[PDB]
Amino acid sequence: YRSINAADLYENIKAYTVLDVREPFELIFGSIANSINIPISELREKWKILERDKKYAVICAHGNRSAAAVEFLSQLGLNIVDVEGGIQSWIEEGYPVVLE
């Protein structure tokens, strides 16, 4: 189990592949660019779609759901990290978000 600051993620944004585990209706209000969306209610059945050769940054609205996802994918041998504060923190700190 590892964690990553917002500033850290943004500075290394190209080194990570943001995994947004929030529900789809939540992304219409803003999401980090190119972040793949897998709701925690599907993560169990569709985590196989995740690349092993990638470094994932799991984001949540506040971090409660991302934390649980990390503990799950971490034991499956995936290189993933939890994003502190969720996307809420990301926005509070003034970071770029997409309306897509």
Would you give an account of this structure?
The protein is of the alpha/beta class. The protein has one domain: Rhodanese-like domain (Oxidized Rhodanese, domain 1, 3-Layer(aba) Sandwich), CATH 3.40.250.10. The chain contains 5 helices and 5 strands, in the order E-H-E-H-E-H-E-H-E-H. Strands 1-5-4-2-3 form a 5-stranded parallel β-sheet. Helix 2 (24-27) links the parallel strand 2 and strand 3 (36-37). The radius of gyration is 12 Å and the shape is globular. The relative contact order is 0.27. The PDB classes it as structural genomics, unknown function. The entry lists the keywords alpha-beta protein, Structural Genomics, Northeast Structural Genomics Consortium, nesg.
Task: List the defining traits of the structure above.
globular, 5-stranded parallel β-sheet, 5 helices, 100 residues, Oxidized Rhodanese, domain 1, 5 strands, alpha/beta
Q: Which second-level CATH architecture applies?
A: 3-Layer(aba) Sandwich
Question: H/E element string?
Answer: EHEHEHEHEH
Query: Going by CATH, what is the homologous superfamily?
Result: Rhodanese-like domain
Strand content: 15-25%
**Strand arrangement in the largest pleated sheet:** 1-5-4-2-3
